[PDB]
Design a protein around this motif. Structure first.
Motif, PDB file in Angstrom:
ATOM      1  N   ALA A 181      -0.394  -0.422 -10.369  1.00  0.00           N
ATOM      2  CA  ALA A 181      -0.348   0.985 -10.732  1.00  0.00           C
ATOM      3  C   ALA A 181      -0.910   1.203 -12.131  1.00  0.00           C
ATOM      4  N   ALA A 231       0.904  -0.196  -6.296  1.00  0.00           N
ATOM      5  CA  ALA A 231       0.853   1.172  -5.797  1.00  0.00           C
ATOM      6  C   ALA A 231      -0.103   1.211  -4.617  1.00  0.00           C
ATOM      7  N   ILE A 265       3.246   4.427  -6.373  1.00  0.00           N
ATOM      8  CA  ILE A 265       4.027   3.229  -6.657  1.00  0.00           C
ATOM      9  C   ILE A 265       5.026   2.990  -5.535  1.00  0.00           C
TER      10      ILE A 265
END
Ligand SMILES: [Mg+2]
Ligand SMILES: [Mg+2]
Ligand SMILES: [Mg+2]
Ligand SMILES: [Mg+2]
Ligand SMILES: [Mg+2]
Ligand SMILES: [Mg+2]
Ligand SMILES: [Mg+2]
Ligand SMILES: [Mg+2]
Ligand SMILES: [Mg+2]
Ligand SMILES: [Mg+2]
Ligand SMILES: [Mg+2]
Ligand SMILES: [Mg+2]
Ligand SMILES: [Mg+2]
Ligand SMILES: [Mg+2]
Ligand SMILES: [Mg+2]
Ligand SMILES: [Mg+2]
Lengths: 220, 87, 25, 182, 144
Positions: free
Chosen positions: D158, D134, D139
Motif C-alpha cells: 500500500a 493492498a 488495504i
RNA sequence: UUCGGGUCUUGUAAUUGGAAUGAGUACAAUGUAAAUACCUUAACGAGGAACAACUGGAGGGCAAGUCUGGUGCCAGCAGCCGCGGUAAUUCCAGCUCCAGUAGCGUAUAUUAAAGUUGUUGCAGUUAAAAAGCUCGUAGUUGAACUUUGGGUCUGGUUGUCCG
RNA sequence: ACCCACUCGGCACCUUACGAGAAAUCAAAGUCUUUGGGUUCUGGGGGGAGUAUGGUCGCAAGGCUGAAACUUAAAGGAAUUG
C-alpha cells in the motif's frame, strides 16, 4: 535378496518361464494360485500393512498356550486386493505368513462410475455386499471424490483396492475386525460377480494358458 | 466399462458359463472348461483345433453339468440325439 | 432357587396378607 | 422488536476428533500455508462441502434442465472467477474433484507468497496483518480474502505503507531522530 | 411376509403399534410419564443448591478398596436429602458443616458411577465459590 | 587417499543486528439528537518483544511418557474397562509431549450414532419375545376377465450427412 | 390279499448345501442389505417382578390386565480347549 523359487506347480513354471504376462490371464481362467511368488512376479508393487494383531489363547492343563492372529491386507491401489488371516506362535512369523496368505488370495475388483463416466473409474460399479459371521458390509457407489465413508479398517481396505470414492454400511457385530474385513472382501470381490448390461455379450472362450503353453510346464 | 472417449477401462472382461450365461468368478474354484477335439473325415483328431465350453461351478455342484454338456454338444453337432429337448 | 418355590413363597405371603385384610375388611 | 439478521456457523468439527492420519494431514496443511489454527481447515472443508452438496444436487437433476443449467453454470462461473477451478474443467463434474488445498491456494496469504513480495509464508501472514498489502489500492489486513483471478494482478504494498513509499515507521523514525540528535 | 401389515390403508394400526411399542424404551417412558419432575431429586434440573447436614465417607465396592469422602445434603428447592461426592484430593476439608453447596449431576445419567455406592451427585460449588478454584488456591472460602 | 572443504541445502543455540506492527494511550476530524464506540490519523506506545494463553489430557477406547520424586489397594483417579498391596507409563507434584485454542472443561436435556422403535428397516426354536387351541364382528387384504392390433398422413425434439 | 408303476392328501424320515443362521442346526429356521404375497399376537439389557396398586372374573384357590421408585455392567445364547 536371496530367492531361487524353484516352481513346483505348472502355473508357477509358466510364470517363471515368462509365458504369462498379465495377472488378468490368471484371473480370467479361474486359475489356482498356490505360490505367492507368482503374485510377486505379476504385481511388483503390492503394498501391505497389518490391520490387527490379536492374542488368542487355548486353555491346556498347564497354563494358557497363546498364539497371535495377524490380519494383513495386501494390494496395489489399482484394483487388486488380498486379505490374509494367520495364526502363529511368534508375531513376526504370524505377520509373514499372513502376508503370504494375502498374496495367495489376491482378487480383482470391478471399479465403476457413479454417473456420466468422464475419466478412470472412481467408485464401484453397482451396490455390493458381503456377510461373514454376523457382520454384513454393504458397499454403495458414491459421487466422484466423495472419499471413503467407511470404518478405518474398511477405509484402508478400499485404499489398498484403489477405490477412491465409496459409501459403506455395516450391520452386526462389526467389532470383530476379521469378520468385518472378510465381509468387505466378499463384497469387493463380488463386485466382479454381478452381471451388468455392459457385460452382456458373449465371448469366444480363449483357450487356457496352460493348454496353449502346456509344453513349457511338466519339468522333464 | 467404457470411457467417454471410447477406450476400455475394464480389466479381464470375464468369461461366462456356456450353459447358464452366468459369469465365472476369478476365484470360482469349481468351474471347468471342456475342450472337444474337431474330427476330420477319416477320424483323425485335428490338433490345435477344437471347441471349448465353459461350465460353471454352480451347475457342477448341483449335478446338471453332464446334462448341460450333453445339450450343448448336441446343439453344435457333436452327439446324435443324446439329449431330448422335451423331457 | 426355583421359580416354582419363589412363586409358592409369594403365594404364602399373599396367604397371610389376604387373611389379615379379611380380618380388617 | 426488530427483524433479526441471521448469524450462521461457517465450520464443522469432524466426527472422529483423534484420527492420527487426519491430524497429521491437518498439521501438514497448517504448516504449509501458515494457518493459525485448525479451524481454518475446518472452514475450507465446510465451504467445499457446501459447494459439493450443491454440485451433487445439481448432478442428480436431469441434463438440460433449467435448474441444472442456471445454477450449475452460475456455480462454475463463480468458482472460475475465484480461480480454484481452472478454465479447462468447467464441466460441473470436475467441480466435485476440488480439494481443500485448492481453496487454500487462493488465499491472499499464498498469493502474496507466490508473487514474491513476501519471501516466507509466515512473512506473508504478518505482512498482510500489518496492513501492507493492498488489493487494488484497498488495504487488506485479512490473510484469506479468497483472491480472485480478475484482481490478482493488482497486489502490491500500500502507498501508506513504508514499502509502497511513505514514512518508514516507529522504529526507523525513532532511530533517525536519535541519530540526528546524537 | 412380516408381522406388520403392509396394505395401503393400514396406517392406523402401524401408527398405534409403534405408539404402543414406544413404551418399551426407557428414555421415551421417562420423558412421557414425566418421572424426572415427580420422583427424581431434581425435576429436569442439571444443578441444585442444598444445605450440608452431616459429613460422611462411604466405603467402595469389592475390587476397589477405599473410602470415598461424600457429604449428605438436604436440597433447598424441595427438601429432599441426597448424598453427594466432593471430587478431589483435599476438598473434603474445604467444605464445612452447614454451608450452602451447589450439587451437579454425576455424569452417568443419574446412576452411581464407578465404585461409589448409593451416590449420584457431584459437588461443584461451596458457599458461592467453586471447588476447583479452592483446590488450586485461586480463591478462598469467604467463611460466613 | 581416513579426511575432507559443506563444495548444495534444512534446522538447534539465555548468542547477536536491522526492521514492521498493532493492544493500549491521544492532538484532531469523522461519527452521533449530543456523546461513546468503529473507519482515518497527529504525538507517544515491543526485547525476556514481563504487552508472558489458557482449558483438559499423556494405560486402552483416543493423539501424546512404561522419565524423576512423593504416597503405598491410603490418599485419591477413573463417563466404561480398570490404576493404587515399596520400582504406580492411571493418584499428588516437576520435566517432556498431545488436542482445541480466546476458548476449553464439566451437568442435565436432546439429536446422529440407534437396522436399540425399524413405513423404507429390527427380532420371536433355544439370547427378551408365537395367546393352549378353535370360531368370530370391526380392521387389514382379497383369483382371472371385458379394443389388442395395425396402415397412412402430420407436428415438434434429438443424434444423424453436409450447406 | 399281495407285487409293479403313477397320483392326491398326512404324521414322518435319510443325504446334501448349491441356500440361511452367532452357531447347535433348518428342506424350512430357504426364496432377507439383490431388504415389500396377506395378516394377527409378542419383545427392546438384568434384577426389582409378573411384585404393588386399580379394575375384572372366581365361593375359595387363584386366573386376566399389570408399572414405577431403586439397583446393576452385565445377565444371557451357541460352540472350542482344558
Ligand atoms: Mg473400608
Ligand atoms: Mg497443563
Ligand atoms: Mg490428571
Ligand atoms: Mg501425571
Ligand atoms: Mg495412543
Ligand atoms: Mg514413580
Ligand atoms: Mg433388536
Ligand atoms: Mg433359558
Ligand atoms: Mg426365551
Ligand atoms: Mg403358539
Ligand atoms: Mg371383518
Ligand atoms: Mg384383481
Ligand atoms: Mg428390561
Ligand atoms: Mg422375569
Ligand atoms: Mg387385585
Ligand atoms: Mg451355555
Amino acid at each position: 535378496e536371496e530367492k531361487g523359487w524353484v516352481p513346483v506347480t505348472k502355473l508357477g513354471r509358466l510364470v517363471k518361464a515368462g509365458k504369462i504376462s498379465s495377472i488378468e490371464e490368471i484371473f480370467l481362467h479361474s486359475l489356482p494360485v498356490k505360490e505367492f511368488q507368482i503374485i510377486d512376479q505379476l504385481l511388483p508393487n503390492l503394498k501391505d500393512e497389518v490391520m490387527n494383531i490379536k492374542p488368542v489363547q487355548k486353555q491346556t492343563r498347564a497354563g494358557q498356550r497363546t498364539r497371535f492372529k495377524a490380519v494383513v491386507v495386501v494390494g496395489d491401489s489399482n484394483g487388486h486386493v488380498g486379505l490374509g488371516i494367520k495364526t502363529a506362535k511368534e508375531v513376526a512369523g504370524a505377520i509373514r505368513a499372513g502376508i503370504i496368505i494375502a498374496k495367495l488370495s489376491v482378487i480383482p475388483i470391478r471399479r465403476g462410475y457413479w454417473g456420466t463416466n468422464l475419466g478412470q473409474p472412481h467408485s464401484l460399479a453397482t451396490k455390493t455386499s458381503g456377510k461373514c459371521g454376523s457382520v454384513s458390509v454393504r458397499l454403495i457407489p458414491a459421487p466422484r471424490g466423495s472419499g471413503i465413508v467407511a470404518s478405518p479398517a474398511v477405509k484402508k481396505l478400499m485404499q489398498l483396492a484403489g477405490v477412491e470414492d465409496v459409501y459403506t454400511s455395516s450391520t452386526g457385530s462389526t467389532r470383530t475386525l476379521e469378520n468385518t474385513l472378510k465381509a468387505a472382501f466378499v463384497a469387493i470381490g463380488n463386485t466382479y460377480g454381478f452381471l451388468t448390461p455392459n457385460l452382456w455379450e458373449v465371448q469366444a472362450l480363449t483357450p487356457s494358458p496352460m493348454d496353449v503353453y502346456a509344453d513349457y510346464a511338466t519339468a522333464s | 466399462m467404457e470411457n467417454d472417449k471410447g477406450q476400455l477401462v475394464e480389466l479381464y472382461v470375464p468369461r461366462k458359463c456356456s450353459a447358464t450365461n452366468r459369469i465365472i468368478k476369478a476365484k470360482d474354484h469349481s468351474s471347468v472348461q471342456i475342450n472337444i477335439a474337431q474330427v476330420d473325415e477319416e477320424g483323425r483328431a485335428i490338433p490345435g483345433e477344437y471347441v471349448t465350453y465353459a461350465l460353471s461351478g454352480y451347475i457342477r455342484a448341483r449335478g446338471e453339468a453332464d446334462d448341460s454338456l450333453n445339450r450343448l454338444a448336441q446343439q453344435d453337432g457333436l452327439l446324435k440325439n443324446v439329449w431330448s429337448y422335451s423331457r | 432357587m426355583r421359580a416354582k418355590w419363589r412363586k409358592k413363597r409369594t403365594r404364602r405371603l399373599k396367604r397371610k396378607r389376604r387373611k389379615v385384610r379379611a380380618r380388617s375388611k | 422488536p426488530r427483524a433479526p439478521r441471521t448469524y450462521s456457523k461457517t465450520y464443522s468439527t469432524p466426527k472422529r476428533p483423534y484420527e492420527s492420519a487426519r491430524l497429521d494431514a491437518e498439521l501438514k496443511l497448517a504448516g504449509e500455508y501458515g494457518l493459525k489454527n485448525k479451524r481454518e481447515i475446518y472452514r475450507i472443508s465446510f465451504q467445499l462441502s457446501k459447494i459439493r452438496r450443491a454440485a451433487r444436487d445439481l448432478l442428480t437433476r436431469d441434463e438440460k434442465d433449467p435448474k441444472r443449467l442456471f445454477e450449475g453454470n452460475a456455480l462454475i462461473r463463480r468458482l472460475v472467477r475465484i480461480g480454484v477451478l481452472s478454465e479447462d474443467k468447467k464441466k460441473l463434474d470436475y467441480v466435485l474433484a476440488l480439494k481443500v488445498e485448492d481453496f487454500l491456494e487462493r488465499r491472499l496469504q499464498t498469493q502474496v507468497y507466490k508473487l514474491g513480495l513476501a519471501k516466507s509464508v509466515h512473512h506473508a501472514r504478518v505482512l498482510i496483518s500489518q496492513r501492507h498489502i493492498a488489493v487494488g489500492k484497498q488495504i487488506v489486513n485479512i490473510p484469506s480474502f479468497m483472491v480472485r483471478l480478475e484482481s490478482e494482478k493488482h497486489i502490491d504494498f500500500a502507498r501508506t505503507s513504508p514499502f509502497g513509499g511513505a514514512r518508514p515507521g516507529r522504529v526507523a523514525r525513532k532511530r533517525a531522530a536519535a541519530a540526528g540528535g546524537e | 411376509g412380516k408381522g406388520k401389515p403392509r396394505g395401503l390403508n393400514s396406517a392406523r394400526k402401524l401408527r398405534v403399534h409403534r405408539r404402543n411399542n414406544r413404551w418399551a424404551e426407557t428414555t421415551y417412558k421417562k420423558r412421557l410419564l414425566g418421572t424426572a419432575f415427580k420422583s427424581s431429586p431434581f425435576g429436569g434440573s442439571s444443578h441444585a443448591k442444598g444445605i450440608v447436614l452431616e459429613k460422611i465417607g462411604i466405603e467402595s465396592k469389592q475390587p476397589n478398596s477405599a473410602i470415598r469422602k461424600c457429604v449428605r445434603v438436604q436440597l433447598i428447592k424441595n427438601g429432599k436429602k441426597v448424598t453427594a461426592f466432593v471430587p478431589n484430593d483435599g476438598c473434603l476439608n474445604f467444605v464445612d458443616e452447614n454451608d450452602e453447596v451447589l450439587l451437579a449431576g454425576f455424569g452417568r445419567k443419574g446412576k452411581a458411577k464407578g465404585d461409589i455406592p448409593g451416590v449420584r451427585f457431584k459437588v461443584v460449588k461451596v458457599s458461592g465459590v467453586s471447588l476447583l478454584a479452592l483446590w488450586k488456591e485461586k480463591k478462598e472460602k469467604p467463611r460466613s
